[PDB]
Amino acid sequence: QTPLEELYNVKVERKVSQRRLDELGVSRWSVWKTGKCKLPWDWQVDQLVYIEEGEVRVVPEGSKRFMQFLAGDLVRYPKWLEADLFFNAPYSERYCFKAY
């Protein structure tokens, strides 16, 4: 088997340093927070997400595996990807949607 984030090419910089967060400008990124629910989404655009707290379980459509992202992971969701994001406990992130 190959890791799920490698097949979908979901880049994940885990435990990001401030030297990268201030380059990306994460302090200016929009906030989103979610508690405990399922969000089905299709990424029409690449999204760059810094998880400020909590955890997310992402299951690509039809998949039975998941990929897990934790606070301090910086995730690049690629466009055209369709996934169901599951949040089991209070969750907060900052995001920027990035066009070509």
Provide the binding-site residues for other proteins, judged by CB under 8 A.
Answer: 1-2, 4, 7-9, 28, 30-39, 44-47, 60-65, 78-80, 87, 95-100
Reading the block at residue 75, the tokens are 């995730």
- 8 A C-beta contact, residue 38 and residue 84: yes
Please say which residue, 72 or 84, places its beta carbon nearer to other proteins.
84
State the minimum distance, in angstroms, from the CB of residue 36 to other proteins.
6
Please say which residue, 60 or 73, places its beta carbon nearer to other proteins.
60
State the minimum distance, in angstroms, from the CB of residue 63 to other proteins.
5
State the minimum distance, in angstroms, from the CB of residue 26 to other proteins.
13
Please say which residue, 70 or 89, places its beta carbon nearer to other proteins.
89
Closest CA to 76 of 96, 54, 100, 90: 96
Go through the chain and tell me how many residues it has: 100
Residue type present at position 80: W
60-86 burial, b at 16+ Cβ within 10 Å, e below that, comes to beeeeebbebeeebbbebeeebebebb
State the minimum distance, in angstroms, from the CB of residue 80 to other proteins.
4
